[PDB]
């Protein structure tokens, strides 16, 4: 099955009034319906009925639930992208961030609990400015974890090419690996340092037809300064006149020269650079690993209050009178989704009428196909009452 | 040559088994690469490779009621209708099952887009069934006009 | 009995081991193939394998069968009905191999993605034996009705 995440707990939130009857076992209420009717009965129930938060007129809930869906899927799609790059960081497991505790609560008993508390939303605020500043601040929290990934993948992608040009290969290398004055030129006005990397085979060709390859040059300058498996890597010190006719005339014997020049700040900055730039990868990678999970949990908490606003907000303009209804949060494990969303569909399906409900169970998230969307947003097909999937 | 009508027996039951088996081969094709781009109609675009696989029972019935009726010594006379008509219903079941794999493929990729095409293939496919049941017809008479068995 | 009287046995086992060896292969190539996106197909992969090889089995009891009944002399009816039974056995396997192969890679690539089909393809791939098994029964009583050579 691939229709849902199946490495995390999903939650199915589901929201009807004090006067609803299911349609799959008559004669039962609701909360007895929910933990006892559930398929396999390991349907766990939790408290998740919110109050009125000064819900205006009819006119302006229609234009807040589409800002309350486009901030819900603005929040889950940053808490995606938190829980992606951390994952992503290699630092938690596959199911790590998604059924873990969190503020040292778990999902069911934290889920339960959740009676509309926040410490920047109270239950005589509107209901706007704190989608606005949930939005905002979850928006922020994964512009801000973004960043920090993204220097933290430029300050790898900096050590890369400084641990490369550091040492290994002949392809790329430059001479900063060497303090020593033997491999260079110290206190020289006309000498220079030029790097020739020469085969295995022809390593002693290369040093004994060095001297009378190019005249005017130092003698005894070759030396074995490195090479992985391959290939003798050796220093050469002359003119810096001959140093083009030199390296044109090595490049004829089928040597690899390596242009260069005597030069300590080259190799002081090249270190530098290094040097800094695993440290700077290092803070780059800490802060952004702090930044994520800190970001992370007030995206979650931002995305469990703003599902929380839209259950009620859809469930008080689809159901009308009364204005209190009875919703709560169903922990169902992965892998039986359909079931729950089938019985669920079946059951409470005729509340909200007899053209609305569908024999359409289950989704279709396949690349070449992208339908079978089980939402009020997609003309393919319609909910017949007010639930909502969440797949963290 | 006694036993000689043993490769009319043989015969229809491999032209029909191979006819069958490549029917099923061409309609299992175009119906599992017809799956991924609608998975709603499987059932119904199932229905040609399992209605191709059926061609080979009138082969397989033929054969067992023609092995049936021989015993361990033939004359001469049985074993030249009884080729033929294992040849004729062989080669019935097999231009059957070879229209009906691309008969089931073209009829599962041109239903998989509309729906409405099923009925046109479904029409169109079950036509495919009257040269084997008139192969099958022939060599059941062919079979049942027979006769000097040992 | 004149002469070829042994190559029935052999032409069973023959095609049945080559549509078998073929089939399999054609099925681990889309299970290695497919394995690398997805592993939740890696298990399911096995039953093309596994019940493609009840197909050789088959073939190699009858080629067992036939090759019990043999001995070192042929009867006059036996070199006509043994290489008909055997040649169509070999058929019908070489035929259920070969088109179970490219359904199960063609099903097993298809059902990467999303796994809807894989109820059809193993629908489709419990149906197939249904040409083996017909042949298995036709070369069986083609293999009953040879006995007592000499």
Same mark, same amino acid.
């Given at each position: ?11 199915? /939130? ?74 992503? /960081? ?20 934290? /889920? ?279 797949? /963290? | ?9 043989? !015969? ?14 061409? !309609? ?40 049936? !009726? ?81």
């Amino acid at each position: 099955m691939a229709t849902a995440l199946y490495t995390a707990n999903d939650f199915i /939130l589901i929201s009807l009034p004090q006067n609803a009857q299911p349609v799959t076992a008559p004669g039962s209420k609701t909360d007895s319906w929910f933990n006892e009717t559930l398929i396999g009965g390991r349907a766990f129930v939790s408290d998740f009925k919110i109050p009125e938060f000064k819900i205006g007129s009819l006119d302006t809930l229609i234009v807040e639930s589409e800002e309350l869906s486009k901030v819900d899927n603005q929040i889950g799609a940053s808490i995606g992208k938190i829980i992606e790059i951390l994952q992503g /960081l290699n630092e938690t497991s596959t199911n790590a961030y998604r059924t873990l505790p969190i503020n040292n609560m778990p999902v069911p008993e934290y /889920l339960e609990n959740f009676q509309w508390q926040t410490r920047k939303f109270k239950l005589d605020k509107s209901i706007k400015d704190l989608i606005t500043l949930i939005s905002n601040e979850s928006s922020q929290l994964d512009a801000d974890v973004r960043a920090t990934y993204a220097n933290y993948n430029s300050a790898k992608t900096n050590l890369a090419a400084a641990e490369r040009k550091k040492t290994g290969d002949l392809s790329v290398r430059s001479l900063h690996d060497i303090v020593k004055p033997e491999d260079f030129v110290l206190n020289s006005e006309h000498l220079t340092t030029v790097l020739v990397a020469v085969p295995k085979s022809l390593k002693s060709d290369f040093e004994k037809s060095y001297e009378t390859l190019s005249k005017n040059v130092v003698p005894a300058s070759a030396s074995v300064i490195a090479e992985d498996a391959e290939y003798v890597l050796f220093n050469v010190h002359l003119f810096k006149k001959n140093v083009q006719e030199f390296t044109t005339a090595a490049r004829e014997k089928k040597f690899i020269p390596r242009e260069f020049n005597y030069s300590e700040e080259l190799i002081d900055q090249l270190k530098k650079e290094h040097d800094s730039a695993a440290s700077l990868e290092q803070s780059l990678r800490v802060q952004l690993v702090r930044l994520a999970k800190t970001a992370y949990v007030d995206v979650f908490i931002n995305w469990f209050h703003i599902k929380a606003l839209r259950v009620y907000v859809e469930s008080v303009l689809r159901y009308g009178l009364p204005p209190h209804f009875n919703i709560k949060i169903i922990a169902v494990p992965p892998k039986n989704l359909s079931k729950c969303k089938s019985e669920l569909i079946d059951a409470f399906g005729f509340l909200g009428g007899n053209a609305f409900m569908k024999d359409k169970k289950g989704k279709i998230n396949k690349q070449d196909t992208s339908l079978h969307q089980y939402a009020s947003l997609v003309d393919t097909e319609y909910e017949p009452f007010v639930m909502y999937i969440i797949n /963290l | 040559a006694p036993f000689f009508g043993a490769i009319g027996c043989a !015969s229809a039951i491999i032209f029909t088994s191979l006819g069958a088996a490549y029917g099923t081969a061409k !309609s299992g094709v175009g119906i599992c690469a017809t799956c991924v781009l609608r998975p709603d109609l499987l059932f119904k675009n199932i229905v040609p490779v399992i209605m191709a696989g059926i061609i080979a029972i009138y082969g397989l019935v033929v054969s067992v009621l023609v092995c049936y !009726s021989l015993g361990q010594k033939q004359a001469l006379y049985t074993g030249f209708i009884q080729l033929g008509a294992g040849l004729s219903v062989g080669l019935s079941g097999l231009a059957a099952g070879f229209a009906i794999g691309i008969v089931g493929d073209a009829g599962v990729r041109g239903s998989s887009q509309q729906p409405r095409l099923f009925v046109g293939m479904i029409l169109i496919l079950i036509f495919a069934e009257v040269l084997g049941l008139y192969g099958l017809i022939v060599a059941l008479l062919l079979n049942s006009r027979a006769t000097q068995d040992v």
